[PDB]
């Protein structure tokens, strides 16, 4: 599943409704958005990703919520 439980952990502000310090992380994701395609497959994302804040703030870190949508 994904590759967020490693990268995203910092970028959790995004998926967690509060991407502030993660702005640099944004550009990081933009550099490795490829594995977030897996995240987008929602294998187990949807339990994580989606829950608590993604719901109302999936973000826009602008690296996209780099689901390979």
Swiss-Prot record:
SS bond partners: 3-35, 11-25, 26-61, 37-68
UniProt keyword annotations, A-Z: Disulfide bond, Lipid-binding, Signal, Transport
GO BP, sorted A to Z: lipid transport
Domain of life: Eukaryota
Molecular-function GO terms, alphabetical: lipid binding
UniProt family annotation: Belongs to the plant LTP family. B11E subfamily.
Function text: Transfer lipids across membranes. May play a role in plant defense or in the biosynthesis of cuticle layers.
Protein name: Non-specific lipid-transfer protein 2
Species in which this protein is naturally found: Oryza sativa subsp. japonica (Rice)
Boundaries of the shown chain within the full protein: 28 to 96 of 96
């Amino acid at each position: 599943a994904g590759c967020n439980a490693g990268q995203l952990t910092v970028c959790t502000g995004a998926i967690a409704g509060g991407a502030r310090p993660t702005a640099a992380c944004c550009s990081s994701l933009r550099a490795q958005q490829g594995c977030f395609c897996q995240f987008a497959k929602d294998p187990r994302y949807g339990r994580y990703v989606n829950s608590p804040n993604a719901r109302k703030a999936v973000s826009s870190c602008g690296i996209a919520l780099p689901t390979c949508h």
